[PDB]
């Protein structure tokens, strides 16, 4: 399955920043419109929670833009769009912010790391390394690590997001909103006659 | 049993839900909940106050994601709203007087009488019941009159 | 008299009077609040900003 | 103006 | 009106009348058996001659009172202008949540 | 009804209570400020 | 013949709003944060004014 | 030209409250925010990052 | 099987029962997080010179309950969001409504 | 001595009665009180639920 | 009616030190408290609670 | 002899009037002017040499 | 409204009416031993026929 | 090897110019100029690579 045919894109979540340049000196947000002066941070993993959103690692200079892309929301507030504006190729029908909880680096009394070697929980019953019959004893586990309930195991969440079947759209207007084909600063008068460069 | 994170909480107030704020000078105050029992919900329903769980927050940040307002039409849009003529009402389909008179113990009969009072407008009546243990005392905030964190 | 089925555990009958409780927001100059709250069928909306 | 001994003196550049 | 043998709740439910002029209120608490009953002139049940709180003015019970809660129009309390810090309930006694 | 002169639920059916010179922006470039809810429309019923 | 019986009538005596103050529920011991909980809902210990 | 801004203006204001108060249940903060002398502000887009 | 702690023979036929789960989460749209309807912890939205408390809501109107049934009307409530957790507490039509 | 203990505090009320003003400007001035004598609270007869 | 108020206003106010002090011999109770312009803060009845 | 003291939180109570709002903006005028002031002294409004 | 067993004390306070026509009062005892609750149409309630 | 640095009493300091307000408020308003502003560079006028 090729991304270029059925909107089969998947590595669309693997994006950090796409900062624009308009005349090979100053950035396109130069005119200070965002929190970040120049950089288009799509995602920042845990450095100032205030850049991130409540249940995703995405930086809020792009979080507004994706809501501003096809949907006409972002300034008034945040509507959850009604059941027609979203097709199966538009935003948030493909991605949803998500988190796990694994193990930290240093906390416990005794911690010697375990890889693929000896998965202990119920191996020798169904699958130790390959699909074979019962060949082992009954015994507690090694690798599977809780963080839940009674067991005193402590760690931090590993929060991110997974976008695939969507395309990142940016308008060209003063406000930046895709109201029709022609935008407010898309093909205005300055943005039609003068020549420029792109080193983004 | 240990999750460090942040969350975003918008205005749940019916009267200031979506308003414009005019240029000027203002000051605001809002309260949050430290008591684990009332704020966080459980599936099966159990007290979280004495049972291990505690609430700690590090930083609060206020945000304003407004429209980049037109500055050629700067003084025009504001001055119109700067009148007793231009106002903003926020109505609801359900405009409640949610008081509470339960069925304590083994109850089968429930009478209601309010003495001579003004009645002007009306939309309807709704009737349903939920456990006394399930509900907290909403006077000061938290009380040991609540444990059912479901 | 609201006669009903008996309960096993103590409940709370949510009495709902669907009456009017709407706001009206002004701003005469830059830093003013003339916002009018009203409890109309209550008739107890005695004070507002 | 200062509520001790009032005076008016300003210079514009 | 009295408060039950171990219970600690009571309302006031009196019908509509003209409320033209007022000066204030004064709540007070006193035992039932410590107080005689009027009307006939003589009491049989009142087998307690001394330490009468109401008919003399001597009053040790006011301190036990927990919270004054006022409502006329069934919606808003005494200051319908949200004057005092706690608008509905008016605390006399405290369970201690903020000792400030 | 004079008690709704402030509340404006009785004062003008649904639109003309504020400055009627700002109706331009709603019917022509409304998409930016889709605003018919800030001023919430009055209820009407025959009798 | 077996059932246990009380002449209970709830129709005459009213059921007006029990006003949502800061603790007037029927009988909840519940739980407080770390400072111990209130015993009963309306028992003789709330009279004892306690500080932590 | 008769519409949206051409001069420089930031869309968001990453504001911090001046005084703090923490107690048994409440998490009070008296934030002192003044809306810019020309620009407007929407309330449906206003939130708290905790 | 055995009435002993530590060492016993009869514990060989010990049957283990799994503990029941309970998800500690949040109600729809983080509701019950701020004191909107509460009166002691009321919002004071004032001016820097004006100093007038705008936000007034009593016990009789649950402000969080008010917008929630209006959230039932604004589009479909089945559309999930992360900054606005559209976590409608629900069950399967097979779980409660038993289809024997 | 070296002991670990926490106190408790309780008030008293002997031989005095409760007193409250019937005023908007909270001050019990005269028989013609600020709100108690005022016509809005002295109109047609209304309910009571204290 | 001449000397009265039928408006929404507070009666008792509480503020915290924004700049909390934790030195060996002094605590600077640093309040950024502004008086209400249509209010009258009584310096006669202004006190600290420790 | 084995004792230590530290402050935690300080609550500022300025229990102010529920004064007439129209009068609150007007009855300041003379003291708001250059002529009037609140001069306040003691018997011991003095300095000491030791 | 009934008089319960061992509970001889009876209250009556009817809420404020718009009542006009009156020729007087009337009061008398009635027995649940001999009265059913009529309104449904049919009642097993009457475990008597006195 | 077992050693750590912790923190206990933190302070900010600011040694202002004790000026006459006559010249202080005039030239802060003259630095409030659209043209007369402030600019600071570096001796290390250099970018970096990794």
Curated annotation (Swiss-Prot), chain B:
Subcellular location(s) of the protein: Virion; Host nucleus
Task performed by this protein: Major capsid protein that self-associates to form 240 hexon trimers, each in the shape of a hexagon, building most of the pseudo T=25 capsid. Assembled into trimeric units with the help of the chaperone shutoff protein. Transported by pre-protein VI to the nucleus where it associates with other structural proteins to form an empty capsid. Might be involved, through its interaction with host dyneins, in the intracellular microtubule-dependent transport of incoming viral capsid to the nucleus.
Native species: Human adenovirus C serotype 5
Lineage start: Viruses, Varidnaviria, Bamfordvirae, Preplasmiviricota, Tectiliviricetes
Induction of its expression: Expressed in the late phase of the viral replicative cycle.
Gene: L3
Quaternary structure and partners: Homotrimer. Interacts with the capsid vertex protein; this interaction binds the peripentonal hexons to the neighboring penton base. Interacts with the hexon-linking protein; this interaction tethers the hexons surrounding the penton to those situated in the central plate of the facet. Interacts with the hexon-interlacing protein; this interaction lashes the hexons together. Interacts with host dyneins DYNC1LI1 and DYNC1I2; this interaction might be involved in intracellular microtubule-dependent transport of incoming viral capsid.
Protein name, as recorded: Hexon protein
Entire protein: shown range: 554 to 703 of 952
Curated annotation (Swiss-Prot), chain C:
Cellular compartment(s): Virion; Host nucleus
Factors inducing expression: Expressed in the late phase of the viral replicative cycle.
Origin superkingdom: Viruses
Record-annotated membrane-spanning stretches: none
Modified-residue entries (Phosphotyrosine), positions: 37
Annotated family: Belongs to the adenoviridae hexon protein family.
Functional note: Major capsid protein that self-associates to form 240 hexon trimers, each in the shape of a hexagon, building most of the pseudo T=25 capsid. Assembled into trimeric units with the help of the chaperone shutoff protein. Transported by pre-protein VI to the nucleus where it associates with other structural proteins to form an empty capsid. Might be involved, through its interaction with host dyneins, in the intracellular microtubule-dependent transport of incoming viral capsid to the nucleus.
Record text on subunit structure and interactions: Homotrimer. Interacts with the capsid vertex protein; this interaction binds the peripentonal hexons to the neighboring penton base. Interacts with the hexon-linking protein; this interaction tethers the hexons surrounding the penton to those situated in the central plate of the facet. Interacts with the hexon-interlacing protein; this interaction lashes the hexons together. Interacts with host dyneins DYNC1LI1 and DYNC1I2; this interaction might be involved in intracellular microtubule-dependent transport of incoming viral capsid.
The protein's name: Hexon protein
Originating organism: Human adenovirus C serotype 5
GN (gene name): L3
UniProtKB/Swiss-Prot annotation, chain D:
Protein localization: Virion
Function summary: Structural component of the virion that acts as a cement protein on the capsid interior and which glue the peripentonal hexons and group-of-nine hexons together.
Protein name from the UniProt record: Hexon-linking protein-C
Organism: Human adenovirus C serotype 5 (HAdV-5)
From Swiss-Prot, chain J:
Induction and repression of expression: Expressed in the late phase of the viral replicative cycle.
Intracellular or extracellular location(s): Virion; Host nucleus
Family label: Belongs to the adenoviridae hexon protein family.
Subunit structure: Homotrimer. Interacts with the capsid vertex protein; this interaction binds the peripentonal hexons to the neighboring penton base. Interacts with the hexon-linking protein; this interaction tethers the hexons surrounding the penton to those situated in the central plate of the facet. Interacts with the hexon-interlacing protein; this interaction lashes the hexons together. Interacts with host dyneins DYNC1LI1 and DYNC1I2; this interaction might be involved in intracellular microtubule-dependent transport of incoming viral capsid.
Function: Major capsid protein that self-associates to form 240 hexon trimers, each in the shape of a hexagon, building most of the pseudo T=25 capsid. Assembled into trimeric units with the help of the chaperone shutoff protein. Transported by pre-protein VI to the nucleus where it associates with other structural proteins to form an empty capsid. Might be involved, through its interaction with host dyneins, in the intracellular microtubule-dependent transport of incoming viral capsid to the nucleus.
Name of protein: Hexon protein
